[PDB]
């Protein structure tokens, strides 16, 4: 139960991070077009 | 207690789908 | 209606001398005794009254209760007695206490579903029936709603009507259900006529719906919202397009475009 | 002691595998012990869990033969045994709560729909079916196919053909097992031909021709032909001959549904192409079927929407449309819209995959 | 086989026959919930009557069926409100799971309700019938003499 709290915490950090992947991915799309255009 | 286990379980399920996206993000 | 003090005897003898209303009056005090005994429920565990003895007396009290209830016009009570009664009639192999009034009740029940125009339930009911083909086809009482269901389905209304008049059971206790049935067909006929005909004479619609007076047909035509001239009925409205909420959908002009773009937009998001 | 718990479990699975007629002598006598085996130190542990170490299938195989009512022998008001099974399966059903349960849970629903299909009432199906959705990614290709098969059967009494066609066509594209190519394959084909009949669009059984017994095929052709040529007379005499067949399979329901269809199919082949079609022809065709309800049936015919026509009987012509569409607005765009949705779901799987 | 004998008596007239019907239904609610789900408005009308005294039993039967549907929150209200149909002192799959949910309900709320007012537990703001089930969970826990559970739920 002190264990359950701890495990929920570890998972939560992980969650914020799963959204975080998506946000860098969106950004990269914009930069890819601009680079390809540049060439 | 049982409900607390379930909340954790659903997070574990979502992650694997993210892992396959961690791979896709690297290709971009 | 008394006969003697005991409920079984009193109910049978009252029921016998007629007095179906009385019988319904008797039915709650009998039902309360029936609940206690535990004969009332279908029996799964051995008690020596699983399908014999005091069980046969209980079955008889439900058979009579069902007959009395329909004759008084209490559809609701008919359903309650028949639901209680039907596990006797069949379960998946319940074959150990059969009567022939059973047969009469099911034909009435089949007719009850039929008259409300529950097509699907009629199909489910045959499925509950343990031998579908033998029980249904042999038995002449049971044959009238089945022949009827075919002829209604095809849109051979006139043949269904002739078969209902000439029956044995019309004399008996199909009389109750006839009134409901007749409205059901006349409505389907009224609806068939609205769609097909652009115009047709008043006299023709009167014969098709089963009136032998013009005025009862003009009153129904008028309720249905058909326009009528002298000597002709008109069907400029063969339908009635619209009908409150349900729009931005189907046959508009630029909400469609928005929707087109939107399907694309989702599609982009997924790919990308 | 770790070893002890494990050792019981492996033994329980093993007894369940053996008892399909090896070192065995009466499936029913043994059922009591199989129920006994199942519930402690196995069924008990799993409370928030599902696996393919627990399998309803093994117990299904066992239970199915008893439901030929030859061990019951119809001496009794209801089976005890099925009620017991049903009680116990419903007990699992509680435990499942759509958090991780889709696996074994789905088999229990196949079993529940089967008992309704044998002799129950199939109006109870609706809830189970809905409950039972939750993302499915743990059910096996054969399991998907059997469930669909049962589901299709449900749909048909409820008078929902299209939905049933999609499911049965989706079923037969699962299952690389050579053990569900055997009699089960035949049952599946039966149902796909029946659905084809009901819609009344019915193509020839060509495809079926090298994947069924020539014995099965000829009667199966006979039914289809009865619809296609559009005779009531032909249809009734085919029902009369192959009575044992329609009874046996239990697709006796066809005889009710199809009769109204057969008579309509028979008008349809007779052309409705031009702005008026003379009343005498259409009357003639119908006269054979029934000549007391020629107006009632044609009106009903129109109402249904299978075909659509306009009648004056103060002109005595029946007026008709081509029955051929237009492309000039949203309705072909709706087909475009369905297709793109299908592609996107598929796209999502390829990326995931 | 069918729940139809029982259900027939549930719509029949006289209070006595309806009291019997409730108790007849009761025994096998769980197995047959699907059929009984349609009859829920009828059962619910007994519940709302405060003249008919087997209201509590009708509620109990409602709860079992809602649980099987997915409406866990709704049944949890309805068992409390019946005023005896919430009993944790029996051990069941029904009881264990809806208790799991009940704690979840109070905890979620408890985050919000602390932020407004830090005396809420002290008061009627979260209704006494809920607060009792929660307080009993604490006692349950303490008896097992493993303190980390009791303190957890309360934190």
CSV table of C-alpha atoms in Angstrom, one decimal, chain D:
chain,number,residue,atom,x,y,z
D,1,UNK,CA,4.9,-25.5,-1.8
D,2,UNK,CA,5.4,-23.0,-4.7
D,3,UNK,CA,5.8,-26.3,-6.6
D,4,UNK,CA,2.7,-27.7,-4.8
D,5,UNK,CA,0.4,-24.9,-6.1
D,6,UNK,CA,1.8,-25.0,-9.6
D,7,UNK,CA,1.7,-28.9,-9.6
D,8,UNK,CA,-2.2,-28.9,-8.9
D,9,UNK,CA,-2.8,-26.5,-11.7
D,10,UNK,CA,-0.8,-28.3,-14.3
D,11,UNK,CA,-2.6,-31.6,-13.2
D,12,UNK,CA,-6.1,-29.8,-13.5
D,13,UNK,CA,-5.3,-28.7,-17.1
D,14,UNK,CA,-4.0,-32.1,-17.9
D,15,UNK,CA,-7.1,-34.0,-16.7
D,16,UNK,CA,-9.2,-31.4,-18.8
D,17,UNK,CA,-7.1,-32.2,-22.0
D,18,UNK,CA,-7.2,-36.1,-21.5
D,19,UNK,CA,-10.9,-36.5,-21.0
D,20,UNK,CA,-11.9,-36.1,-24.7
D,21,UNK,CA,-12.4,-39.9,-24.8
D,22,UNK,CA,-9.0,-41.1,-23.7
D,23,UNK,CA,-8.8,-43.0,-20.4
D,24,UNK,CA,-12.3,-42.1,-19.9
D,25,UNK,CA,-15.8,-43.9,-19.9
D,26,UNK,CA,-18.7,-41.3,-19.4
D,27,UNK,CA,-18.4,-37.6,-19.9
D,28,UNK,CA,-21.5,-37.0,-17.8
D,29,UNK,CA,-20.5,-39.2,-14.8
D,30,UNK,CA,-17.2,-37.4,-14.9
D,31,UNK,CA,-18.6,-33.8,-15.1
D,32,UNK,CA,-19.1,-33.6,-11.3
D,33,UNK,CA,-15.3,-34.1,-10.8
D,34,UNK,CA,-14.5,-31.6,-13.6
D,35,UNK,CA,-16.7,-28.9,-11.9
D,36,UNK,CA,-14.8,-30.0,-8.6
D,37,UNK,CA,-11.4,-29.6,-10.3
D,38,UNK,CA,-12.1,-26.3,-11.9
D,39,UNK,CA,-13.3,-24.2,-8.9
D,40,UNK,CA,-10.6,-24.5,-6.0
D,41,UNK,CA,-7.1,-23.3,-6.7
D,42,UNK,CA,-7.7,-22.2,-10.2
D,43,UNK,CA,-11.0,-20.4,-10.8
D,44,UNK,CA,-10.7,-18.9,-7.3
D,45,UNK,CA,-7.2,-17.3,-7.9
D,46,UNK,CA,-8.3,-15.5,-11.0
D,47,UNK,CA,-10.4,-12.6,-9.8
D,48,UNK,CA,-9.1,-9.8,-11.8
D,49,UNK,CA,-7.4,-11.9,-14.3
D,50,UNK,CA,-7.9,-13.8,-17.6
D,51,UNK,CA,-5.6,-16.1,-19.5
D,52,UNK,CA,-5.5,-19.0,-21.9
D,53,UNK,CA,-4.6,-21.2,-19.0
D,54,UNK,CA,-8.3,-20.9,-18.1
D,55,UNK,CA,-10.4,-22.1,-21.1
D,56,UNK,CA,-14.2,-22.4,-21.4
D,57,UNK,CA,-13.6,-24.4,-24.7
D,58,UNK,CA,-12.4,-27.5,-22.9
D,59,UNK,CA,-15.6,-27.3,-20.8
D,60,UNK,CA,-17.8,-26.4,-23.8
D,61,UNK,CA,-16.6,-29.6,-25.5
D,62,UNK,CA,-17.6,-31.5,-22.6
D,63,UNK,CA,-20.9,-29.9,-22.0
D,64,UNK,CA,-22.1,-29.8,-25.6
D,65,UNK,CA,-22.9,-33.5,-26.1
D,66,UNK,CA,-25.1,-33.6,-23.0
D,67,UNK,CA,-27.5,-31.1,-24.7
D,68,UNK,CA,-28.7,-33.7,-27.1
D,69,UNK,CA,-31.1,-34.6,-24.2
D,70,UNK,CA,-30.4,-38.3,-24.5
D,71,UNK,CA,-28.9,-38.5,-20.9
D,72,UNK,CA,-31.8,-36.3,-19.7
D,73,UNK,CA,-34.2,-38.3,-21.8
D,74,UNK,CA,-37.1,-35.8,-21.3
D,75,UNK,CA,-38.4,-37.4,-18.1
D,76,UNK,CA,-38.0,-34.1,-16.4
D,77,UNK,CA,-39.6,-30.6,-16.3
D,78,UNK,CA,-36.3,-28.8,-17.0
D,79,UNK,CA,-32.7,-29.8,-17.2
D,80,UNK,CA,-30.9,-29.1,-13.8
D,81,UNK,CA,-27.5,-29.4,-15.4
D,82,UNK,CA,-27.8,-26.6,-18.0
D,83,UNK,CA,-29.1,-24.3,-15.2
D,84,UNK,CA,-26.1,-25.2,-13.1
D,85,UNK,CA,-23.7,-24.4,-16.0
D,86,UNK,CA,-25.5,-21.2,-16.8
D,87,UNK,CA,-25.4,-20.2,-13.1
D,88,UNK,CA,-21.7,-20.8,-13.0
D,89,UNK,CA,-21.0,-19.0,-16.3
D,90,UNK,CA,-23.0,-16.0,-15.2
D,91,UNK,CA,-21.0,-16.1,-11.9
D,92,UNK,CA,-17.8,-15.5,-14.0
D,93,UNK,CA,-19.7,-12.8,-15.9
D,94,UNK,CA,-19.9,-10.7,-12.7
D,95,UNK,CA,-16.2,-10.9,-12.2
D,96,UNK,CA,-15.7,-9.6,-15.7
D,97,UNK,CA,-16.1,-5.9,-15.8
D,98,UNK,CA,-14.4,-4.9,-19.0
D,99,UNK,CA,-10.9,-4.0,-17.7
D,100,UNK,CA,-8.9,-6.8,-19.1
D,101,UNK,CA,-11.7,-9.4,-19.6
D,102,UNK,CA,-12.5,-9.9,-23.3
D,103,UNK,CA,-10.6,-13.2,-23.6
D,104,UNK,CA,-12.4,-16.0,-21.8
D,105,UNK,CA,-15.4,-13.7,-21.4
D,106,UNK,CA,-16.3,-13.8,-25.0
D,107,UNK,CA,-16.5,-17.7,-25.1
D,108,UNK,CA,-19.1,-17.5,-22.2
D,109,UNK,CA,-21.3,-15.2,-24.4
D,110,UNK,CA,-20.9,-17.7,-27.3
D,111,UNK,CA,-22.2,-20.4,-25.0
D,112,UNK,CA,-25.1,-18.1,-23.8
D,113,UNK,CA,-26.3,-17.3,-27.4
D,114,UNK,CA,-26.1,-21.0,-28.3
D,115,UNK,CA,-28.5,-22.1,-25.6
D,116,UNK,CA,-30.9,-19.3,-26.9
D,117,UNK,CA,-30.4,-20.7,-30.5
D,118,UNK,CA,-31.1,-24.3,-29.4
D,119,UNK,CA,-34.5,-23.5,-27.7
D,120,UNK,CA,-34.5,-20.3,-25.7
D,121,UNK,CA,-35.6,-16.7,-26.7
D,122,UNK,CA,-33.0,-14.5,-28.4
D,123,UNK,CA,-34.3,-11.1,-27.2
D,124,UNK,CA,-32.0,-11.4,-24.1
D,125,UNK,CA,-29.0,-11.4,-26.6
D,126,UNK,CA,-29.0,-7.7,-27.0
D,127,UNK,CA,-27.3,-6.7,-23.7
D,128,UNK,CA,-24.7,-9.4,-23.7
D,129,UNK,CA,-23.6,-8.5,-27.1
D,130,UNK,CA,-23.2,-4.8,-26.2
D,131,UNK,CA,-21.6,-5.6,-22.7
D,132,UNK,CA,-19.5,-7.8,-24.1
D,133,UNK,CA,-17.5,-4.8,-26.5
D,134,UNK,CA,-14.3,-3.3,-25.2
D,135,UNK,CA,-11.2,-3.4,-27.4
D,136,UNK,CA,-10.6,-6.9,-28.6
D,137,UNK,CA,-7.0,-7.8,-29.1
D,138,UNK,CA,-6.7,-11.1,-27.2
D,139,UNK,CA,-9.4,-13.3,-28.8
D,140,UNK,CA,-8.2,-16.0,-31.2
D,141,UNK,CA,-9.0,-16.1,-35.0
D,142,UNK,CA,-11.2,-19.2,-34.7
D,143,UNK,CA,-13.0,-17.7,-31.6
D,144,UNK,CA,-13.8,-14.5,-33.5
D,145,UNK,CA,-15.2,-16.5,-36.3
D,146,UNK,CA,-17.6,-18.7,-34.1
D,147,UNK,CA,-18.8,-15.7,-32.2
D,148,UNK,CA,-19.7,-14.0,-35.5
D,149,UNK,CA,-21.4,-17.1,-36.7
D,150,UNK,CA,-23.7,-17.1,-33.5
D,151,UNK,CA,-24.2,-13.4,-33.8
D,152,UNK,CA,-25.3,-13.7,-37.5
D,153,UNK,CA,-27.9,-16.3,-36.3
D,154,UNK,CA,-29.3,-13.8,-33.8
D,155,UNK,CA,-29.5,-11.1,-36.4
D,156,UNK,CA,-31.6,-13.1,-38.9
D,157,UNK,CA,-34.6,-13.8,-36.5
D,158,UNK,CA,-34.5,-9.9,-35.7
D,159,UNK,CA,-34.8,-9.4,-39.5
D,160,UNK,CA,-31.4,-7.7,-39.9
D,161,UNK,CA,-29.8,-9.4,-43.1
D,162,UNK,CA,-27.1,-6.9,-44.1
D,163,UNK,CA,-25.5,-6.9,-40.7
D,164,UNK,CA,-25.5,-10.7,-40.7
D,165,UNK,CA,-24.0,-10.9,-44.3
D,166,UNK,CA,-21.0,-8.7,-43.2
D,167,UNK,CA,-20.3,-10.9,-40.1
D,168,UNK,CA,-20.5,-14.3,-41.9
D,169,UNK,CA,-18.3,-13.0,-44.8
D,170,UNK,CA,-15.7,-11.6,-42.0
D,171,UNK,CA,-16.0,-15.1,-40.2
D,172,UNK,CA,-14.7,-17.3,-43.0
D,173,UNK,CA,-11.6,-15.1,-43.5
D,174,UNK,CA,-10.3,-16.2,-39.9
D,175,UNK,CA,-9.2,-19.7,-39.0
D,176,UNK,CA,-6.2,-21.4,-40.8
D,177,UNK,CA,-6.9,-24.5,-38.7
D,178,UNK,CA,-7.7,-27.6,-40.8
D,179,UNK,CA,-10.0,-28.7,-38.0
D,180,UNK,CA,-12.6,-25.9,-38.6
D,181,UNK,CA,-12.4,-26.8,-42.4
D,182,UNK,CA,-14.3,-30.0,-41.5
D,183,UNK,CA,-18.1,-30.1,-40.6
D,184,UNK,CA,-18.0,-26.5,-39.1
D,185,UNK,CA,-17.1,-25.2,-42.5
D,186,UNK,CA,-20.2,-26.8,-43.9
D,187,UNK,CA,-22.5,-25.1,-41.2
D,188,UNK,CA,-20.9,-21.7,-42.0
D,189,UNK,CA,-21.6,-22.2,-45.8
D,190,UNK,CA,-25.2,-23.1,-45.0
D,191,UNK,CA,-25.7,-19.9,-43.2
D,192,UNK,CA,-24.1,-17.7,-46.0
D,193,UNK,CA,-26.4,-19.3,-48.7
D,194,UNK,CA,-29.4,-18.8,-46.3
D,195,UNK,CA,-28.6,-15.0,-45.9
D,196,UNK,CA,-28.3,-14.8,-49.8
D,197,UNK,CA,-31.7,-16.2,-50.1
D,198,UNK,CA,-33.3,-13.8,-47.6
D,199,UNK,CA,-32.0,-10.6,-49.4
D,200,UNK,CA,-33.3,-12.4,-52.6
D,201,UNK,CA,-30.3,-11.0,-54.5
D,202,UNK,CA,-29.0,-14.6,-54.6
D,203,UNK,CA,-26.2,-15.6,-56.9
D,204,UNK,CA,-25.5,-19.1,-58.1
D,205,UNK,CA,-23.7,-21.5,-55.6
D,206,UNK,CA,-20.6,-21.7,-57.9
D,207,UNK,CA,-18.0,-20.9,-55.3
D,208,UNK,CA,-19.6,-23.5,-52.9
D,209,UNK,CA,-19.3,-26.2,-55.6
D,210,UNK,CA,-15.7,-27.5,-54.8
D,211,UNK,CA,-16.0,-27.0,-51.0
D,212,UNK,CA,-19.2,-29.0,-50.0
D,213,UNK,CA,-20.5,-32.5,-50.7
D,214,UNK,CA,-22.3,-32.9,-54.1
D,215,UNK,CA,-25.0,-34.4,-51.9
D,216,UNK,CA,-25.3,-31.2,-49.9
D,217,UNK,CA,-25.2,-29.1,-53.1
D,218,UNK,CA,-28.0,-30.4,-55.1
D,219,UNK,CA,-30.8,-29.6,-52.5
D,220,UNK,CA,-29.0,-26.3,-51.8
D,221,UNK,CA,-29.2,-25.5,-55.6
D,222,UNK,CA,-32.9,-26.5,-55.6
D,223,UNK,CA,-33.8,-23.9,-53.0
D,224,UNK,CA,-31.9,-21.1,-54.8
D,225,UNK,CA,-33.4,-21.9,-58.1
D,226,UNK,CA,-36.9,-21.9,-56.5
D,227,UNK,CA,-36.3,-18.2,-55.5
D,228,UNK,CA,-34.5,-17.3,-58.7
D,229,UNK,CA,-37.1,-18.4,-61.2
D,230,UNK,CA,-39.7,-16.9,-59.0
D,231,UNK,CA,-42.3,-19.6,-58.8
D,232,UNK,CA,-44.4,-20.2,-55.6
D,233,UNK,CA,-45.3,-23.7,-57.1
D,234,UNK,CA,-41.7,-24.6,-57.6
D,235,UNK,CA,-40.8,-23.3,-54.1
D,236,UNK,CA,-43.5,-25.2,-52.2
D,237,UNK,CA,-42.7,-28.6,-53.9
D,238,UNK,CA,-38.9,-28.0,-53.1
D,239,UNK,CA,-39.9,-27.4,-49.4
D,240,UNK,CA,-42.0,-30.6,-49.5
D,241,UNK,CA,-39.1,-32.8,-50.9
D,242,UNK,CA,-36.3,-31.6,-48.7
D,243,UNK,CA,-38.3,-31.5,-45.6
D,244,UNK,CA,-36.0,-33.6,-43.6
D,245,UNK,CA,-33.1,-31.3,-44.6
D,246,UNK,CA,-34.7,-28.0,-43.6
D,247,UNK,CA,-35.8,-29.6,-40.3
D,248,UNK,CA,-32.6,-31.2,-39.6
D,249,UNK,CA,-30.5,-28.1,-39.9
D,250,UNK,CA,-33.1,-26.2,-38.0
D,251,UNK,CA,-33.5,-23.5,-40.8
D,252,UNK,CA,-37.1,-24.1,-41.0
D,253,UNK,CA,-37.7,-20.3,-40.4
D,254,UNK,CA,-36.9,-19.8,-44.1
D,255,UNK,CA,-40.3,-21.2,-45.1
D,256,UNK,CA,-42.1,-18.1,-43.3
D,257,UNK,CA,-39.7,-15.3,-44.4
D,258,UNK,CA,-39.0,-16.4,-48.0
D,259,UNK,CA,-42.6,-16.9,-49.2
D,260,UNK,CA,-43.4,-13.2,-49.3
D,261,UNK,CA,-39.9,-12.7,-50.8
D,262,UNK,CA,-40.4,-15.4,-53.5
D,263,UNK,CA,-43.6,-13.8,-54.8
D,264,UNK,CA,-42.0,-10.4,-55.0
D,265,UNK,CA,-38.9,-11.7,-56.8
D,266,UNK,CA,-41.4,-13.2,-59.3
D,267,UNK,CA,-42.9,-9.8,-60.1
D,268,UNK,CA,-39.4,-8.2,-60.3
D,269,UNK,CA,-38.0,-10.3,-63.2
D,270,UNK,CA,-41.1,-9.1,-65.2
D,271,UNK,CA,-39.9,-5.5,-66.3
D,272,UNK,CA,-40.8,-2.2,-64.7
D,273,UNK,CA,-38.5,-0.2,-67.0
D,274,UNK,CA,-40.8,2.3,-68.9
D,275,UNK,CA,-42.9,5.2,-67.9
D,276,UNK,CA,-46.1,3.0,-67.9
D,277,UNK,CA,-46.2,-0.8,-67.7
D,278,UNK,CA,-49.6,-2.1,-68.8
D,279,UNK,CA,-51.8,-3.3,-65.9
D,280,UNK,CA,-52.9,-6.5,-67.7
D,281,UNK,CA,-49.4,-8.1,-67.7
D,282,UNK,CA,-48.6,-7.5,-64.1
D,283,UNK,CA,-52.2,-8.6,-63.2
D,284,UNK,CA,-51.5,-11.9,-65.2
D,285,UNK,CA,-48.4,-12.8,-63.4
D,286,UNK,CA,-50.0,-12.1,-60.0
D,287,UNK,CA,-53.2,-14.0,-60.8
D,288,UNK,CA,-51.3,-17.3,-60.7
D,289,UNK,CA,-50.2,-16.5,-57.0
D,290,UNK,CA,-53.5,-15.2,-55.9
D,291,UNK,CA,-56.3,-13.4,-57.9
D,292,UNK,CA,-58.4,-12.1,-54.9
D,293,UNK,CA,-55.5,-9.9,-53.6
D,294,UNK,CA,-54.0,-8.6,-56.8
D,295,UNK,CA,-54.4,-4.8,-55.8
D,296,UNK,CA,-53.6,-5.5,-52.1
D,297,UNK,CA,-50.3,-7.3,-52.8
D,298,UNK,CA,-49.2,-4.9,-55.4
D,299,UNK,CA,-49.8,-2.0,-53.1
D,300,UNK,CA,-48.0,-3.9,-50.3
D,301,UNK,CA,-45.2,-4.5,-52.7
D,302,UNK,CA,-44.6,-0.8,-53.3
D,303,UNK,CA,-44.9,-0.1,-49.6
D,304,UNK,CA,-42.0,-2.4,-48.8
D,305,UNK,CA,-39.5,-0.4,-50.8
D,306,UNK,CA,-38.1,-3.5,-52.6
D,307,UNK,CA,-39.5,-2.1,-55.7
D,308,UNK,CA,-41.5,1.2,-56.0
D,309,UNK,CA,-44.4,2.0,-58.3
D,310,UNK,CA,-47.4,4.3,-58.8
D,311,UNK,CA,-50.9,3.0,-59.7
D,312,UNK,CA,-54.0,4.5,-61.1
D,313,UNK,CA,-57.0,2.2,-61.5
D,314,UNK,CA,-58.9,4.9,-62.9
D,315,UNK,CA,-56.6,4.7,-65.8
D,316,UNK,CA,-55.7,1.1,-65.1
D,317,UNK,CA,-52.0,1.4,-65.7
D,318,UNK,CA,-49.1,0.8,-63.3
D,319,UNK,CA,-46.5,3.5,-63.6
D,320,UNK,CA,-42.9,2.8,-62.8
D,321,UNK,CA,-39.3,4.0,-62.5
D,322,UNK,CA,-36.2,2.6,-64.2
D,323,UNK,CA,-34.7,1.5,-60.8
D,324,UNK,CA,-31.4,3.1,-61.9
D,325,UNK,CA,-29.8,5.8,-59.7
D,326,UNK,CA,-28.2,9.2,-60.3
D,327,UNK,CA,-24.7,10.5,-59.2
D,328,UNK,CA,-25.4,14.2,-58.9
D,329,UNK,CA,-25.5,14.7,-55.1
D,330,UNK,CA,-24.6,13.3,-51.7
D,331,UNK,CA,-25.5,9.6,-52.0
D,332,UNK,CA,-22.4,8.4,-54.0
D,333,UNK,CA,-20.4,10.8,-51.8
D,334,UNK,CA,-21.7,8.7,-48.8
D,335,UNK,CA,-20.0,5.6,-50.4
D,336,UNK,CA,-16.8,7.7,-50.8
D,337,UNK,CA,-17.1,8.6,-47.1
D,338,UNK,CA,-17.5,5.0,-45.9
D,339,UNK,CA,-14.5,3.9,-47.9
D,340,UNK,CA,-12.1,6.5,-46.5
D,341,UNK,CA,-13.2,5.5,-42.9
D,342,UNK,CA,-12.4,1.8,-43.6
D,343,UNK,CA,-8.9,2.8,-45.1
D,344,UNK,CA,-8.1,5.0,-42.0
D,345,UNK,CA,-8.8,2.2,-39.5
D,346,UNK,CA,-6.8,-0.2,-41.7
D,347,UNK,CA,-3.9,2.5,-41.8
D,348,UNK,CA,-3.9,2.9,-38.0
D,349,UNK,CA,-3.4,-1.0,-37.9
D,350,UNK,CA,-0.5,-1.0,-40.3
D,351,UNK,CA,1.3,1.8,-38.5
D,352,UNK,CA,0.6,0.1,-35.0
D,353,UNK,CA,1.6,-3.1,-36.6
